[PDB]
Symmetry: C4
Subunit: 162 residues, 4 copies
């Protein structure tokens, strides 16, 4: 029953990014076995700076990277760009009112990358965009982490008990 908070953070002049792994969900079967019913994912939390070495997490914006989206990121060319579009209320009533776009791209003339999260949310009147540049080494740690975590998110470390 041990529970771990192991967010990985990158702190820059104007913004911070925290990446938190989230476990898959399971359903109990009639037989007493468990079936994976939802994949794990990574929760990305972006916040603006508010003073030297501080960030305002009350103004955070979040974006969930799915297993397939992680697939995109680990298979990217060294200088390939990508973009992901989420409506958090697809298939619900509030559909269309919250729009989130995550861009991940190489930095211009540089060896690092940026992450940018824009969120337009009409339910709470928020229109926000947080940009954060990452060094090559920082990106390499992310990619190492993403590659490592993928099989765990789909539960494959957990077959083969016995």
């Amino acid at each position: 029953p041990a529970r771990f908070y192991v967010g990985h953070s990158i702190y820059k002049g104007k913004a911070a990014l925290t990446v938190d792994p989230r476990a898959p969900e399971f359903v109990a079967l009639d037989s007493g076995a468990f079936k994976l019913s939802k994949d794990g994912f990574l929760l990305l939390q972006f916040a603006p700076s508010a003073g030297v070495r501080q960030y305002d997490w009350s103004k955070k914006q979040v974006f969930s990277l799915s297993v397939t989206e992680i697939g995109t990121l680990v298979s990217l060319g060294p200088r390939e760009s990508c973009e992901f579009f989420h409506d958090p209320f697809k298939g619900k009533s509030d559909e269309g009112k919250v729009r989130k776009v995550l861009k991940v791209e190489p930095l211009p003339d540089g060896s690092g990358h940026f992450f940018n999260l824009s969120v337009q949310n009409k339910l709470v009147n928020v229109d926000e965009s947080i940009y954060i540049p990452i060094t090559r080494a920082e990106f390499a740690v992310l990619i190492s982490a993403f590659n490592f975590v993928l099989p765990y998110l789909i539960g494959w470390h957990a077959f083969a008990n016995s």
Copy 2:
């Protein structure tokens, strides 16, 4: 008993679905109480045709196992290299030669994705059917990640790796 987990990974498309399930290696107990690997694990691919909007008819499914060596082929493929595998599910058994399955894995025409195509000729029941499914680049990358990850588990080396600490705790040298 320890918990048993089902962790099928699925891709759902317009005309077909694919589910991939890992199957554990088998071991035997020895007289000494040691466990010997008796059968490698494998992956089971299950393909099913669409029956309406994002529903599939699993009573019409066709299946194909991927062995450790076939996974080796898949993980070592060039970026746009094709491969093809030929199976007789009853090879060496009495229905040998009755059923032939062909799995093709190839890049999509002028695209960055792949397809899997499973063709089955079953002469026991007069079935000659094929199921095709497209896989995006991102989806394929998840598959290849999973395949690379699972390979050492399928050959039992995980069990070795994870027995090291507990073993050291009982068998170690002591100073003089």
Copy 3:
């Protein structure tokens, strides 16, 4: 208490030795009983000069820590790319600016190996010393394997990954 393991990995050469030790991340208990990551792990490199035939003087050793981000640099290097890291062991402390350490990692001249060179200027004790060690291609490949392996452990993600099963056993959905 659980067993504690020392697993230093060493390379011994003609004029110098290098030992690399992993250091675990630190966690804190929370009021809820949950554990929060409080400090990333790192690697400690310890370099020592030869004192005779394959003996080294560890009382003359110089050390250098590699952070998670520095390991990121190392694992992402081009095949013959150079890198260099600059440390002040007392940065932010009262001895800030007294001690400077530089680690260089570069390919060997017209060879397939690498060297590590650690230079230390310690103005507290009038020490200005450097230790150089050559690393073969095979040795470097072991280091890079180890570094890639350890990175998710150093950020605590292993602890996450390995808590999944046990957690599912208690928290899961039940049918209706």
Copy 4:
């Protein structure tokens, strides 16, 4: 205390190869901690065929691949050759009487590889050479296994208890 035999075998027309992982050794310290004192390694066991789908393991020859040698193999170019020379009695009295050479090379005009183990042993009057060709897929499984096992052989999975 669970013990596993998980040899991985490749069986061909004239020869078989079995690869068995071997755990590192530890010494108990005064403090109750344990220190890694010998790296793990891989034991390669080669045997000649003796009839259809059978091999004579009484005529086996063996070669221990060290962590550094595994380093060589995982960092090889796609068609790079390598060779390893062992005297099993270096630093002992019988030094010089047993000579073993393992060659691993791409197959000529082919995408597979071969392993060849030659052993000249004057202590028991053995002069033997076992050659086995491996397919690209079979080699890819080996390399996957070798990459996977390396950090375990040096005990790195075992730091961070607590």
